[PDB]
Amino acid sequence: LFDENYYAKAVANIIGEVKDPIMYKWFSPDQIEDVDLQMGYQKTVKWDAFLNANPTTIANEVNTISTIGFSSEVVRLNYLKLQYKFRHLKQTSEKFYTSDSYIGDINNNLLPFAQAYKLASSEIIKLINHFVLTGTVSIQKDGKNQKRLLPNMYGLLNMPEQIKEEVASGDKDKMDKIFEKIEAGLSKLELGDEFSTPMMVIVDPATSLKLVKPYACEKWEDVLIQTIKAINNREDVYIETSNLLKHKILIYPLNSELIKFKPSKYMLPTPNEQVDKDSTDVAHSYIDFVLGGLLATRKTILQVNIKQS
Amino acid sequence: LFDENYYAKAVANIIGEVKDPIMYKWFSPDQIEDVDLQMGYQKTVKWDAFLNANPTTIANEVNTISTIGFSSEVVRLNYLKLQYKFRHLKQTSEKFYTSDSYIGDINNNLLPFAQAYKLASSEIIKLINHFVLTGTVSIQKDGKNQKRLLPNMYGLLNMPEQIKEEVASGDKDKMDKIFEKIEAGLSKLELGDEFSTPMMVIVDPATSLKLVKPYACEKWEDVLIQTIKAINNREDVYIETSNLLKHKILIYPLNSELIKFKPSKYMLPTPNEQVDKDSTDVAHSYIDFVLGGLLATRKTILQVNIKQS
Amino acid sequence: INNNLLPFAQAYKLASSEIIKLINHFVLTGTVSIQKDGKNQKRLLPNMYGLLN
Amino acid sequence: ASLLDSNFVPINFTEFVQAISNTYKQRRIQFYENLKR
Amino acid sequence: ASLLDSNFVPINFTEFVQAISNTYKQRRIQFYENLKR
Amino acid sequence: YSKSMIENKVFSSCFKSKNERVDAYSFACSSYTDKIEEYLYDPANSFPYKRGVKLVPKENSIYVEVGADTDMYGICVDVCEFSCTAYVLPITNNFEGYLVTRNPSIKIGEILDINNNGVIIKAGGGPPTAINIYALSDSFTINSINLIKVAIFGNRGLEKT
Amino acid sequence: MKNPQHDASLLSNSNEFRDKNVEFFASGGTRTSKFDKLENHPFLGYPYKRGVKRVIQSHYEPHVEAGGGEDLYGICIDIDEFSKTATIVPITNNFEGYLVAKDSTVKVKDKLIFNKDGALEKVTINATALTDAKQISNEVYLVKVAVFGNK
């Protein structure tokens, strides 16, 4: 294949230069598990057991014993296939554009296939990270003109049936009020028997700037860490800053029994076999990726929104 | 055996997927020693020596020498055998229920034997942990309809002849009063010459939330840890949170000379050889376990109860 | 003879013959019954038919 | 005799139960070895 | 089948895509191995 | 209604009080040598799951329909909706398990009676009870259907009041 | 007690094979089937070989105690003192064996009812006496009956 497909050879050679997605920092290694699918839906079944009565004492002869029951629950997950197209120089035309220590038309913004694919893959990975964090697909800083997605396709921020808190616009700069809302949400959290787990907090730059302020010789960040430690059995609490958010705070456990990410094993960018060729030196190529696969239990994510107006 | 007993083969192949009990975190490695007994009582004899007089100086001739005496104490521990029954599919019938990516009837809540056994064992282990911590057996959130247990079958919370402290319902929110009661209990604690040992504290989630409050830049947790270090020769002090407790605080050393857990080596869930079979595809299986075996010296456990009414 | 007890082989052969007759009747007619009148029919599932019904 | 060994072939149910108990004990020992408070 | 293996030689585009997926999975595993918090 | 009752967007959230489910295993304490029988039930008249049923011999088959204590054949413990088949524990056998009730406030130890709908009610309604039924737990509501743990052991010699 | 454990100094001669089963230590029933339902229950008092009623109320699970009448739940055929448990045959299951009788008036062919103390007394009906009442010791009378339910 490599003897025939120069583009496949180039992809195999330059696949290592693409940086790792930053969304991996938001999950534990056990929380992520790939699935084999491109587009469609997939049903997940979770089994449980419960005790029906007090246990039976085994003495002398007895036939009536307490029972253990079972239960099941089914959750549907949707997966969507998306594609992009990019232009590049034809393989046989690179010799006519190899300049001094650089290849490609500076005037016409034409690149070799390997560099074009690397840059496009990086951009697509950034878009995938944005979708996973926010649950929406948009290329604008406002967050508008969002692409319409299927139901059962949510991010960490828009997952339904979770603890939503809202800070009024009048208290947009009152860290005491923000922390009061955070404490209320933390109290409303329901971890059950899986409370002994590390916790992850994701904030925006303005929230981090407010956090590093003194607590009204302790900081709001230290107070928040202590409060979360009071509920997570004195375990690790990680704090992260993301520019993708705007006046939002996300708190969730890094436990595979509560939140599980099951992406398609084709989620990350993959070249398409089709290449558009003509009589000129310009060709076109396609990159595929797959979105969807976040699964969570009810009342395990705290989402705080600080209204600005 | 594995050529004949498919259920034994499955239990052997899936026994490793059952998670370890959480009660192991409340004891030191040396504190636990298994015994060989299913149901009944076992008498443990503890020997001691004492000095009758001052030692004798060896000089010139002498025949009258000071003596060293011996003493014994007998302690009886009761062990109880309990059983549970669960339904599952039959091995020859699993092929007709092997669906895509899962096995079992979703409608009828029927599972293969391996998964059913794993879930039942997990539930029974949770019950065993609750019994070891509290000393009672119940399946209701209110703690009612308790199974009546034999004498000499105690847990950490209900062990007699220990230090018991009570915080009045009017002082249920006064951490200063709660800490005063804790200090009184710690003063009443008697460890003798075994004081140089690590200490363990177990608290309910509400008490955990109260502990991280500022002391009235120091925390109530820090003050408590310092107070316990004052008495335990500044050894390690561990703090644990359990949802199995409600408005209770347990403080006890991790020394095998004061508190010892001698569980039956059949305490953890074990399959029974009997399997109910008929002409249908449904079969029944039994799981056995054993309760009892906590031994403690007098006045070595501090149990603080905060009354709510 | 006095108690109508047979060896397992003969009992199984006779029972299998009777069940095969019942299966043939079901395949031909679409109904399952043990009466000549054709009443007291066993209720079957939908999308289960014979050549006659 | 434990279930961890691939060479272990139980002969009867008593040996199977003994192997289960030994496996539980070994898992407890391993948990205490790997535990770092 | 991984692109990180020098000796690997794909036969067709399907095997190439499988190798790409395996490479991404291995890179994720390596990232979690090297991650420090 | 039904027992299984559906795709979910998210999963539903200790071991205590997890048995409060409509599709839970009916027998709190089971036992081999318990006789279980199969019958047909009306798929449009009344859903017999976890209700006291009576035998109605129809012109095509013997069905089971929800019935009162006066003419009760047994307790319907399970249903297979695919074949519309009801599984019945005869009244001659003991039972200890969860059954459908219509009173959301019933205490423990109270005497109970099965009404015309095959539903557990308080025995003080007035009809003379003919079965020994006792409440082993307080009635709980699943959000809505009310269930209660009961012990049923045979008929009562003389009808009470 | 079912088995009063007392040490002896001489062996007791036991060779006759007749009139050796009518004793207070002989638990179970004279005739038993594999398909008989047996339930273990916590007990109070000593309801051995007596009719038992289920008493329902720190709250505890319901227990069984000696009783009868409209509250009759079953018959206690065996007892475990160490675990403080009792094996019970429910009233819906027929039983044949020796049970405690109130006095010696009970004779063969007599219809018998479980009184408030769980003892069988002459006349709903619950049992039919199969033999005469026999005094095991002091005022303890054992009568063989065939329990069939309640009228």
PDB file of N, CA, C and O in Angstrom, chain G residues 16-67:
ATOM      1  N   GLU G  16     -33.704 -52.474  74.492  1.00  0.00           N
ATOM      2  CA  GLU G  16     -35.041 -52.664  73.943  1.00  0.00           C
ATOM      3  C   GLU G  16     -35.305 -51.655  72.831  1.00  0.00           C
ATOM      4  O   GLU G  16     -35.015 -50.464  72.975  1.00  0.00           O
ATOM      5  N   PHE G  17     -35.857 -52.136  71.720  1.00  0.00           N
ATOM      6  CA  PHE G  17     -36.122 -51.299  70.558  1.00  0.00           C
ATOM      7  C   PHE G  17     -37.552 -50.780  70.508  1.00  0.00           C
ATOM      8  O   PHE G  17     -37.932 -50.146  69.519  1.00  0.00           O
ATOM      9  N   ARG G  18     -38.352 -51.029  71.542  1.00  0.00           N
ATOM     10  CA  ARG G  18     -39.734 -50.579  71.592  1.00  0.00           C
ATOM     11  C   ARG G  18     -39.916 -49.586  72.731  1.00  0.00           C
ATOM     12  O   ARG G  18     -39.218 -49.648  73.747  1.00  0.00           O
ATOM     13  N   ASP G  19     -40.868 -48.670  72.547  1.00  0.00           N
ATOM     14  CA  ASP G  19     -41.128 -47.585  73.494  1.00  0.00           C
ATOM     15  C   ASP G  19     -39.855 -46.793  73.783  1.00  0.00           C
ATOM     16  O   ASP G  19     -39.533 -46.473  74.930  1.00  0.00           O
ATOM     17  N   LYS G  20     -39.125 -46.473  72.717  1.00  0.00           N
ATOM     18  CA  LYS G  20     -37.881 -45.727  72.821  1.00  0.00           C
ATOM     19  C   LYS G  20     -37.914 -44.416  72.053  1.00  0.00           C
ATOM     20  O   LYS G  20     -36.926 -43.672  72.080  1.00  0.00           O
ATOM     21  N   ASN G  21     -39.022 -44.099  71.381  1.00  0.00           N
ATOM     22  CA  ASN G  21     -39.123 -42.885  70.586  1.00  0.00           C
ATOM     23  C   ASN G  21     -39.940 -41.785  71.242  1.00  0.00           C
ATOM     24  O   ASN G  21     -39.787 -40.621  70.863  1.00  0.00           O
ATOM     25  N   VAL G  22     -40.795 -42.116  72.207  1.00  0.00           N
ATOM     26  CA  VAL G  22     -41.672 -41.128  72.834  1.00  0.00           C
ATOM     27  C   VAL G  22     -40.841 -40.467  73.927  1.00  0.00           C
ATOM     28  O   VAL G  22     -40.853 -40.872  75.089  1.00  0.00           O
ATOM     29  N   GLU G  23     -40.087 -39.443  73.534  1.00  0.00           N
ATOM     30  CA  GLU G  23     -39.231 -38.714  74.455  1.00  0.00           C
ATOM     31  C   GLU G  23     -39.182 -37.258  74.028  1.00  0.00           C
ATOM     32  O   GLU G  23     -39.463 -36.924  72.874  1.00  0.00           O
ATOM     33  N   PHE G  24     -38.826 -36.390  74.976  1.00  0.00           N
ATOM     34  CA  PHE G  24     -38.841 -34.959  74.715  1.00  0.00           C
ATOM     35  C   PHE G  24     -37.671 -34.528  73.835  1.00  0.00           C
ATOM     36  O   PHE G  24     -37.740 -33.465  73.209  1.00  0.00           O
ATOM     37  N   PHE G  25     -36.607 -35.334  73.766  1.00  0.00           N
ATOM     38  CA  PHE G  25     -35.448 -35.000  72.945  1.00  0.00           C
ATOM     39  C   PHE G  25     -35.622 -35.369  71.475  1.00  0.00           C
ATOM     40  O   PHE G  25     -34.841 -34.903  70.639  1.00  0.00           O
ATOM     41  N   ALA G  26     -36.612 -36.193  71.139  1.00  0.00           N
ATOM     42  CA  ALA G  26     -36.814 -36.642  69.761  1.00  0.00           C
ATOM     43  C   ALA G  26     -37.455 -35.515  68.963  1.00  0.00           C
ATOM     44  O   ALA G  26     -38.668 -35.306  69.023  1.00  0.00           O
ATOM     45  N   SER G  27     -36.639 -34.788  68.203  1.00  0.00           N
ATOM     46  CA  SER G  27     -37.117 -33.669  67.409  1.00  0.00           C
ATOM     47  C   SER G  27     -37.635 -34.162  66.059  1.00  0.00           C
ATOM     48  O   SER G  27     -37.592 -35.352  65.742  1.00  0.00           O
ATOM     49  N   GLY G  28     -38.137 -33.230  65.253  1.00  0.00           N
ATOM     50  CA  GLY G  28     -38.667 -33.576  63.951  1.00  0.00           C
ATOM     51  C   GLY G  28     -40.047 -34.202  64.039  1.00  0.00           C
ATOM     52  O   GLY G  28     -40.804 -33.998  64.993  1.00  0.00           O
ATOM     53  N   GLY G  29     -40.376 -34.981  63.007  1.00  0.00           N
ATOM     54  CA  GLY G  29     -41.647 -35.660  62.949  1.00  0.00           C
ATOM     55  C   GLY G  29     -41.462 -37.147  62.719  1.00  0.00           C
ATOM     56  O   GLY G  29     -40.420 -37.604  62.247  1.00  0.00           O
ATOM     57  N   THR G  30     -42.503 -37.904  63.075  1.00  0.00           N
ATOM     58  CA  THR G  30     -42.468 -39.349  62.880  1.00  0.00           C
ATOM     59  C   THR G  30     -42.365 -39.703  61.402  1.00  0.00           C
ATOM     60  O   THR G  30     -41.604 -40.601  61.023  1.00  0.00           O
ATOM     61  N   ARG G  31     -43.124 -39.015  60.556  1.00  0.00           N
ATOM     62  CA  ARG G  31     -43.039 -39.166  59.111  1.00  0.00           C
ATOM     63  C   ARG G  31     -42.787 -37.800  58.494  1.00  0.00           C
ATOM     64  O   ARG G  31     -43.490 -36.835  58.808  1.00  0.00           O
ATOM     65  N   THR G  32     -41.788 -37.721  57.619  1.00  0.00           N
ATOM     66  CA  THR G  32     -41.402 -36.462  57.004  1.00  0.00           C
ATOM     67  C   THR G  32     -41.170 -36.679  55.517  1.00  0.00           C
ATOM     68  O   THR G  32     -40.746 -37.755  55.089  1.00  0.00           O
ATOM     69  N   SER G  33     -41.456 -35.644  54.735  1.00  0.00           N
ATOM     70  CA  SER G  33     -41.243 -35.655  53.297  1.00  0.00           C
ATOM     71  C   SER G  33     -40.137 -34.676  52.930  1.00  0.00           C
ATOM     72  O   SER G  33     -39.924 -33.668  53.611  1.00  0.00           O
ATOM     73  N   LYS G  34     -39.430 -34.986  51.841  1.00  0.00           N
ATOM     74  CA  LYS G  34     -38.387 -34.089  51.357  1.00  0.00           C
ATOM     75  C   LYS G  34     -38.956 -32.728  50.985  1.00  0.00           C
ATOM     76  O   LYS G  34     -38.264 -31.709  51.102  1.00  0.00           O
ATOM     77  N   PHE G  35     -40.218 -32.685  50.561  1.00  0.00           N
ATOM     78  CA  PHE G  35     -40.850 -31.466  50.076  1.00  0.00           C
ATOM     79  C   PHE G  35     -41.643 -30.748  51.163  1.00  0.00           C
ATOM     80  O   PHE G  35     -42.635 -30.074  50.866  1.00  0.00           O
ATOM     81  N   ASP G  36     -41.222 -30.881  52.417  1.00  0.00           N
ATOM     82  CA  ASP G  36     -41.809 -30.130  53.518  1.00  0.00           C
ATOM     83  C   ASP G  36     -41.059 -28.818  53.696  1.00  0.00           C
ATOM     84  O   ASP G  36     -39.828 -28.779  53.636  1.00  0.00           O
ATOM     85  N   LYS G  37     -41.808 -27.740  53.912  1.00  0.00           N
ATOM     86  CA  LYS G  37     -41.224 -26.414  54.059  1.00  0.00           C
ATOM     87  C   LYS G  37     -40.834 -26.171  55.511  1.00  0.00           C
ATOM     88  O   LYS G  37     -41.655 -26.334  56.418  1.00  0.00           O
ATOM     89  N   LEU G  38     -39.580 -25.777  55.724  1.00  0.00           N
ATOM     90  CA  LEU G  38     -39.038 -25.505  57.048  1.00  0.00           C
ATOM     91  C   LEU G  38     -38.472 -24.094  57.067  1.00  0.00           C
ATOM     92  O   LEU G  38     -37.731 -23.710  56.157  1.00  0.00           O
ATOM     93  N   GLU G  39     -38.814 -23.324  58.099  1.00  0.00           N
ATOM     94  CA  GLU G  39     -38.356 -21.944  58.210  1.00  0.00           C
ATOM     95  C   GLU G  39     -37.697 -21.732  59.563  1.00  0.00           C
ATOM     96  O   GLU G  39     -38.247 -22.136  60.590  1.00  0.00           O
ATOM     97  N   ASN G  40     -36.531 -21.097  59.573  1.00  0.00           N
ATOM     98  CA  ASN G  40     -35.862 -20.768  60.824  1.00  0.00           C
ATOM     99  C   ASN G  40     -36.265 -19.364  61.257  1.00  0.00           C
ATOM    100  O   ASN G  40     -36.294 -18.439  60.441  1.00  0.00           O
ATOM    101  N   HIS G  41     -36.605 -19.217  62.538  1.00  0.00           N
ATOM    102  CA  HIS G  41     -37.047 -17.935  63.063  1.00  0.00           C
ATOM    103  C   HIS G  41     -36.443 -17.676  64.435  1.00  0.00           C
ATOM    104  O   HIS G  41     -36.242 -18.621  65.214  1.00  0.00           O
ATOM    105  N   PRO G  42     -36.133 -16.421  64.755  1.00  0.00           N
ATOM    106  CA  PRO G  42     -35.774 -16.084  66.137  1.00  0.00           C
ATOM    107  C   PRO G  42     -36.961 -16.306  67.061  1.00  0.00           C
ATOM    108  O   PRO G  42     -38.106 -16.026  66.704  1.00  0.00           O
ATOM    109  N   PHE G  43     -36.679 -16.799  68.263  1.00  0.00           N
ATOM    110  CA  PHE G  43     -37.726 -17.147  69.209  1.00  0.00           C
ATOM    111  C   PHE G  43     -37.456 -16.493  70.556  1.00  0.00           C
ATOM    112  O   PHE G  43     -36.324 -16.133  70.885  1.00  0.00           O
ATOM    113  N   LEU G  44     -38.526 -16.342  71.331  1.00  0.00           N
ATOM    114  CA  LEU G  44     -38.451 -15.950  72.729  1.00  0.00           C
ATOM    115  C   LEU G  44     -39.164 -16.995  73.575  1.00  0.00           C
ATOM    116  O   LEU G  44     -40.130 -17.621  73.130  1.00  0.00           O
ATOM    117  N   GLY G  45     -38.683 -17.179  74.801  1.00  0.00           N
ATOM    118  CA  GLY G  45     -39.197 -18.236  75.650  1.00  0.00           C
ATOM    119  C   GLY G  45     -38.659 -19.595  75.248  1.00  0.00           C
ATOM    120  O   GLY G  45     -37.463 -19.732  74.982  1.00  0.00           O
ATOM    121  N   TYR G  46     -39.522 -20.608  75.206  1.00  0.00           N
ATOM    122  CA  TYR G  46     -39.122 -21.943  74.761  1.00  0.00           C
ATOM    123  C   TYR G  46     -40.318 -22.604  74.096  1.00  0.00           C
ATOM    124  O   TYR G  46     -41.079 -23.343  74.735  1.00  0.00           O
ATOM    125  N   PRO G  47     -40.516 -22.362  72.800  1.00  0.00           N
ATOM    126  CA  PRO G  47     -41.715 -22.867  72.120  1.00  0.00           C
ATOM    127  C   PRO G  47     -41.549 -24.254  71.519  1.00  0.00           C
ATOM    128  O   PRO G  47     -42.303 -24.626  70.614  1.00  0.00           O
ATOM    129  N   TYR G  48     -40.566 -25.015  71.996  1.00  0.00           N
ATOM    130  CA  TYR G  48     -40.274 -26.323  71.420  1.00  0.00           C
ATOM    131  C   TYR G  48     -41.485 -27.248  71.508  1.00  0.00           C
ATOM    132  O   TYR G  48     -42.133 -27.346  72.554  1.00  0.00           O
ATOM    133  N   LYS G  49     -41.777 -27.931  70.397  1.00  0.00           N
ATOM    134  CA  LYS G  49     -42.918 -28.845  70.292  1.00  0.00           C
ATOM    135  C   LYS G  49     -44.224 -28.164  70.686  1.00  0.00           C
ATOM    136  O   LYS G  49     -45.048 -28.724  71.411  1.00  0.00           O
ATOM    137  N   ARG G  50     -44.423 -26.944  70.193  1.00  0.00           N
ATOM    138  CA  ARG G  50     -45.612 -26.176  70.526  1.00  0.00           C
ATOM    139  C   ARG G  50     -46.016 -25.332  69.328  1.00  0.00           C
ATOM    140  O   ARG G  50     -45.226 -25.099  68.408  1.00  0.00           O
ATOM    141  N   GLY G  51     -47.270 -24.887  69.345  1.00  0.00           N
ATOM    142  CA  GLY G  51     -47.725 -23.942  68.344  1.00  0.00           C
ATOM    143  C   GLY G  51     -47.119 -22.569  68.573  1.00  0.00           C
ATOM    144  O   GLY G  51     -47.055 -22.070  69.697  1.00  0.00           O
ATOM    145  N   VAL G  52     -46.689 -21.941  67.484  1.00  0.00           N
ATOM    146  CA  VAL G  52     -45.949 -20.688  67.532  1.00  0.00           C
ATOM    147  C   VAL G  52     -46.706 -19.628  66.746  1.00  0.00           C
ATOM    148  O   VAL G  52     -47.273 -19.908  65.681  1.00  0.00           O
ATOM    149  N   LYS G  53     -46.708 -18.412  67.286  1.00  0.00           N
ATOM    150  CA  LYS G  53     -47.282 -17.235  66.659  1.00  0.00           C
ATOM    151  C   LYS G  53     -46.178 -16.218  66.410  1.00  0.00           C
ATOM    152  O   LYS G  53     -45.212 -16.124  67.178  1.00  0.00           O
ATOM    153  N   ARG G  54     -46.335 -15.453  65.332  1.00  0.00           N
ATOM    154  CA  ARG G  54     -45.347 -14.461  64.924  1.00  0.00           C
ATOM    155  C   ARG G  54     -45.699 -13.120  65.556  1.00  0.00           C
ATOM    156  O   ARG G  54     -46.736 -12.528  65.242  1.00  0.00           O
ATOM    157  N   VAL G  55     -44.835 -12.645  66.447  1.00  0.00           N
ATOM    158  CA  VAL G  55     -45.001 -11.364  67.118  1.00  0.00           C
ATOM    159  C   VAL G  55     -44.152 -10.324  66.400  1.00  0.00           C
ATOM    160  O   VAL G  55     -42.950 -10.534  66.172  1.00  0.00           O
ATOM    161  N   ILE G  56     -44.783  -9.206  66.047  1.00  0.00           N
ATOM    162  CA  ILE G  56     -44.157  -8.108  65.320  1.00  0.00           C
ATOM    163  C   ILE G  56     -44.239  -6.862  66.188  1.00  0.00           C
ATOM    164  O   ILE G  56     -45.311  -6.535  66.708  1.00  0.00           O
ATOM    165  N   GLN G  57     -43.114  -6.169  66.342  1.00  0.00           N
ATOM    166  CA  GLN G  57     -43.080  -4.941  67.132  1.00  0.00           C
ATOM    167  C   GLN G  57     -43.970  -3.863  66.522  1.00  0.00           C
ATOM    168  O   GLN G  57     -43.762  -2.673  66.754  1.00  0.00           O
ATOM    169  N   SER G  58     -34.720   0.942  69.462  1.00  0.00           N
ATOM    170  CA  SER G  58     -34.178  -0.066  68.561  1.00  0.00           C
ATOM    171  C   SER G  58     -35.261  -1.052  68.137  1.00  0.00           C
ATOM    172  O   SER G  58     -35.797  -1.791  68.962  1.00  0.00           O
ATOM    173  N   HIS G  59     -35.579  -1.055  66.847  1.00  0.00           N
ATOM    174  CA  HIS G  59     -36.601  -1.935  66.302  1.00  0.00           C
ATOM    175  C   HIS G  59     -35.956  -3.195  65.742  1.00  0.00           C
ATOM    176  O   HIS G  59     -34.918  -3.133  65.078  1.00  0.00           O
ATOM    177  N   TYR G  60     -36.578  -4.339  66.013  1.00  0.00           N
ATOM    178  CA  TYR G  60     -36.029  -5.635  65.647  1.00  0.00           C
ATOM    179  C   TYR G  60     -37.002  -6.393  64.754  1.00  0.00           C
ATOM    180  O   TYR G  60     -38.196  -6.087  64.696  1.00  0.00           O
ATOM    181  N   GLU G  61     -36.470  -7.391  64.055  1.00  0.00           N
ATOM    182  CA  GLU G  61     -37.284  -8.200  63.166  1.00  0.00           C
ATOM    183  C   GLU G  61     -38.283  -9.032  63.972  1.00  0.00           C
ATOM    184  O   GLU G  61     -38.044  -9.341  65.142  1.00  0.00           O
ATOM    185  N   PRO G  62     -39.418  -9.394  63.371  1.00  0.00           N
ATOM    186  CA  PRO G  62     -40.426 -10.169  64.103  1.00  0.00           C
ATOM    187  C   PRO G  62     -39.885 -11.514  64.564  1.00  0.00           C
ATOM    188  O   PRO G  62     -39.047 -12.132  63.904  1.00  0.00           O
ATOM    189  N   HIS G  63     -40.378 -11.963  65.711  1.00  0.00           N
ATOM    190  CA  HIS G  63     -39.950 -13.230  66.295  1.00  0.00           C
ATOM    191  C   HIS G  63     -41.158 -14.146  66.458  1.00  0.00           C
ATOM    192  O   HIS G  63     -42.270 -13.813  66.056  1.00  0.00           O
ATOM    193  N   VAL G  64     -40.935 -15.326  67.031  1.00  0.00           N
ATOM    194  CA  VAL G  64     -42.000 -16.298  67.248  1.00  0.00           C
ATOM    195  C   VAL G  64     -42.036 -16.669  68.721  1.00  0.00           C
ATOM    196  O   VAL G  64     -40.993 -16.760  69.377  1.00  0.00           O
ATOM    197  N   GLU G  65     -43.242 -16.872  69.242  1.00  0.00           N
ATOM    198  CA  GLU G  65     -43.395 -17.286  70.629  1.00  0.00           C
ATOM    199  C   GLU G  65     -44.578 -18.234  70.741  1.00  0.00           C
ATOM    200  O   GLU G  65     -45.449 -18.276  69.869  1.00  0.00           O
ATOM    201  N   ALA G  66     -44.596 -19.000  71.830  1.00  0.00           N
ATOM    202  CA  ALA G  66     -45.664 -19.966  72.052  1.00  0.00           C
ATOM    203  C   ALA G  66     -47.021 -19.277  72.057  1.00  0.00           C
ATOM    204  O   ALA G  66     -47.211 -18.251  72.718  1.00  0.00           O
ATOM    205  N   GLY G  67     -47.965 -19.844  71.316  1.00  0.00           N
ATOM    206  CA  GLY G  67     -49.278 -19.243  71.197  1.00  0.00           C
ATOM    207  C   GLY G  67     -50.151 -20.051  70.265  1.00  0.00           C
ATOM    208  O   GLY G  67     -49.767 -21.125  69.796  1.00  0.00           O
TER     209      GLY G  67
END
